[PDB]
Design a protein around this motif. Structure first.
Motif, mmCIF file in Angstrom:
data_model
loop_
_atom_site.group_PDB
_atom_site.id
_atom_site.type_symbol
_atom_site.label_atom_id
_atom_site.label_comp_id
_atom_site.label_asym_id
_atom_site.label_seq_id
_atom_site.Cartn_x
_atom_site.Cartn_y
_atom_site.Cartn_z
ATOM 1 N N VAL A 146 38.350 41.644 51.927
ATOM 2 C CA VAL A 146 38.211 40.238 52.323
ATOM 3 C C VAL A 146 39.311 39.368 51.710
ATOM 4 C CG1 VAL A 146 36.876 38.104 52.095
ATOM 5 C CG2 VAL A 146 35.704 40.258 52.718
ATOM 6 N N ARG A 147 39.624 39.607 50.431
ATOM 7 C CA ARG A 147 40.600 38.755 49.732
ATOM 8 C C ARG A 147 42.042 39.048 50.156
ATOM 9 N NH1 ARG A 147 38.230 37.941 43.603
ATOM 10 N NH2 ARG A 147 40.464 37.497 43.315
ATOM 11 N N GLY A 148 42.302 40.273 50.589
ATOM 12 C CA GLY A 148 43.587 40.624 51.174
ATOM 13 C C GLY A 148 44.762 40.974 50.280
ATOM 14 N N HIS A 149 44.539 41.079 48.970
ATOM 15 C CA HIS A 149 45.635 41.376 48.041
ATOM 16 C C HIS A 149 45.368 42.580 47.155
ATOM 17 C CE1 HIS A 149 48.009 37.689 48.770
ATOM 18 N NE2 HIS A 149 46.830 37.170 49.069
ATOM 19 N N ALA A 150 46.402 43.391 46.912
ATOM 20 C CA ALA A 150 46.269 44.534 46.001
ATOM 21 C C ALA A 150 45.634 44.009 44.731
ATOM 22 C CB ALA A 150 47.616 45.177 45.724
ATOM 23 N N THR A 161 41.224 41.324 39.884
ATOM 24 C CA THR A 161 42.424 40.655 39.425
ATOM 25 C C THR A 161 43.570 41.099 40.322
ATOM 26 O OG1 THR A 161 41.739 40.588 37.083
ATOM 27 C CG2 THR A 161 44.046 40.364 37.499
ATOM 28 N N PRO A 162 44.139 40.181 41.096
ATOM 29 C CA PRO A 162 45.252 40.545 41.976
ATOM 30 C C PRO A 162 46.453 41.003 41.156
ATOM 31 C CG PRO A 162 44.868 38.144 41.980
ATOM 32 C CD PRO A 162 43.746 38.765 41.222
ATOM 33 N N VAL A 163 47.127 42.060 41.612
ATOM 34 C CA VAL A 163 48.297 42.619 40.925
ATOM 35 C C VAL A 163 49.293 43.111 41.958
ATOM 36 C CG1 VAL A 163 47.251 43.270 38.741
ATOM 37 C CG2 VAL A 163 47.050 44.768 40.712
HETATM 38 CL CL LIG Z 1 42.950 37.526 45.527
#
Ligand SMILES: [Cl-]
Ligand SMILES: C[C@](O)(CO)[C@H](O)COP(=O)(O)OP(=O)(O)OC[C@H]1O[C@@H](n2ccc(N)nc2=O)[C@H](O)[C@@H]1O
Ligand SMILES: Nc1ncnc2c1ncn2[C@@H]1O[C@H](COP(=O)(O)OP(=O)(O)NP(=O)(O)O)[C@@H](O)[C@H]1O
Length: 283
Positions: A146-150, A161-163
């Motif tokens: 849903v959030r779309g980021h690694a 935690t996006p990285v």
């Molecule tokens: Cl995110």
């Protein structure tokens, strides 16, 4: 009008089991990256408030399908705050390319894509935060999609935690066996005492998956897939298996190994990406 939406797979670039909660769930430290490859979901809006999944997904009943559960969950939540227009409904179909489970998160991706797509199409105006919050009830992988980021995930997978890890090319194989997530997690020999470490440490340390030893031991064909791939490149299990991936710097090498590999590896080649194809298509 029909709209088409990506539903990409994921890989756990690494997966460490740090302990077990009071309820038996396992605490983890894991890293998600999307693959630029997956299913495609098509949606046509309805005005009678109905949700109809037009395509049966092998062995999954309509109401059990994560596509339908996601759509109903969004409908209910949005209606609770008066953000769902009267009559909102949808016909949904899927072109299913991903295996069932296998550690690619196909079902969770389907649910996430549906949440994001219907939120957009019904004009509910919910934030990605709200969608990820409801998505969690359908599975720990859903919020990541849903959030779309690694993202680096901790707790039992709910703390994100996006990285930005290196994007590589992957050869993803699957011998055919369907490994139920709980079968690996309930194994007596499963490592459950891997020390909790910082993100910086984990990103510089060799990547591995704590479930792999168990998957290899209990499923001979997973062990064989690993044996074959390790002949060509660094390879490991994703999720609780059965899928295994081999890492490559370029698409050409990955595809050349795919031509050489046993056909029963049922392999595909895909690029790892830190921005989900779902969100990319919405730019
Ligand atoms: Cl995110
Ligand atoms: C391990 C991952 O595949 C990594 O991507 C996911 O975090 C799995 O999480 P999930 O799909 O949300 O969990 P489910 O597949 O619904 O859980 C099935 C069962 O696996 C076991 N399970 C799952 C996740 C976890 N952190 N500890 C566990 O012991 C539990 O008995 C659970 O009831
Ligand atoms: N749209 C869907 N696509 C795939 N699997 C579904 C779907 N809806 C429900 N499922 C069920 O999800 C099961 C896979 O369990 P797993 O937990 O979830 P996953 O996100 O599909 N794959 P994984 O990466 O291994 O966690 C399948 O055996 C299906 O019965």
């Amino acid at each position: 009008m029909r709209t088409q939406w990506p539903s990409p797979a994921k890989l756990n670039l690494f997966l460490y089991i740090t302990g077990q909660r009071a309820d038996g769930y396992h605490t983890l430290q894991t890293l998600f990256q999307f693959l630029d490859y997956g299913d495609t979901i098509s949606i046509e809006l309805r005005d009678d408030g109905d949700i109809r999944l037009l395509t049966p997904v092998e062995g999954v009943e309509h109401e059990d399908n994560l596509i339908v559960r996601a759509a109903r969950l969004l409908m209910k939540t949005a209606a609770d705050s008066g953000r769902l227009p009267t009559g909102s409904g949808a016909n949904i179909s899927i072109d299913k390319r991903l295996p069932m489970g296998g550690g690619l998160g196909g079902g969770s991706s389907n649910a996430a894509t549906v949440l994001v797509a219907l939120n957009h199409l019904w004009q509910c105006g919910l934030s990605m935060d709200e969608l990820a919050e409801m998505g969690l009830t359908l599975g720990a992988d859903v919020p990541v999609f849903v959030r779309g980021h690694a993202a680096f995930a901790e707790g039992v997978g709910e703390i994100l935690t996006p990285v930005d890890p290196p994007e590589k090319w992957y050869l993803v194989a699957h011998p055919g066996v369907s490994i139920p997530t709980p079968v690996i997690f309930k194994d007596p020999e499963l490592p459950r005492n891997t020390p909790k470490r910082s993100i910086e440490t984990l990103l510089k340390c060799e990547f591995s998956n704590d479930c792999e030893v168990i998957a290899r031991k209990r499923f001979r064909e997973v062990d064989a897939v690993l044996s074959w791939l390790l002949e060509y490149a660094p390879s490991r299990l994703t999720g609780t298996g059965a899928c295994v991936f081999a890492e490559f710097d370029t698409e050409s090498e990955a595809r050349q190994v795919l031509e050489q590999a046993p056909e029963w590896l049922n392999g595909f080649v895909a690029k790892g990406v830190n921005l989900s194809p779902l969100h990319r298509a919405m730019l």
